[PDB]
Amino acid sequence: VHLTPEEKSAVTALWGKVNVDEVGGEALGRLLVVYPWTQRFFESFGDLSTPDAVMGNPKVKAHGKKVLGAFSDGLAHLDNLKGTFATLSELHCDKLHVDPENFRLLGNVLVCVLAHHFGKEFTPPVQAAYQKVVAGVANALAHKYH
């Protein structure tokens, strides 16, 4: 993923302000509510029967924090996403059988959450830079499918 020095600076500055306890869980929760078939992968989380049940579920919040950590890892390795994520891609493809279209959906839900938290500060150029990042992350998670 190539980001301009201006984009790198804007992405890093906004990322440093992200509420690490909330943003991941909100992105995961929204994925589960907006694309309901994704709930099939998280049966062990228990009650996901309503939007409020999903958003307030502690397993969604804890797992969402791990997912956010992985996007953070992506941002730190933009020149080597396939390498960094090799074992993560193996898990999602060989063990979990997650169709790769869902990785694109999660990346875009995360962008919606960032817009929701940052308001007008999530400017169109800041979004454009984040789109390159989430596309890179999605492609890296799908790379072990062949």
């Binding site: 929760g29 929204r30 509510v33 907006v34 939007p51 999903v54 958003m55 875009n108 962008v111 919606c112 959450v113 817009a115 929701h116 940052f118 308001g119 007008k120 999530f122 169109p124 150029p125 979004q127 454009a128 789109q131």
Partner: protein
Amino acid sequence: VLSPADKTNVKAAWGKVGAHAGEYGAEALERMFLSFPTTKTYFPHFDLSHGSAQVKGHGKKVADALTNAVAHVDDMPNALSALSDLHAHKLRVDPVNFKLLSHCLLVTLAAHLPAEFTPAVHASLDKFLASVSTVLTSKYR
């Protein structure tokens, strides 16, 4: 397929746009052209620079078409027939571009109407924009 709750959620959130229709529509287009530059290839005749009067005018047309779609949510093939003629028969817009603009509209709504953009409303708006997208990309005349 939209649920009765989906229809009311869409009516309520989109209803809060009101006079800010053109501004949200223009911002969604701006976000789309910057984030997904290939979408610019459908608008070679447009001035696409920041604060472009052409993008602002177009943003108002897109937002007003969505307001009309909300007002005829149970009769979208008939209500949007001229827009399907344009996007499906004349412009031949690849359906991927509709996913991109729909995403940019959701981002615009999340940034500027946070109190409205709840998970339930987000799900309903996504389904509504996907339904509008299928109508505009289908040849059904």
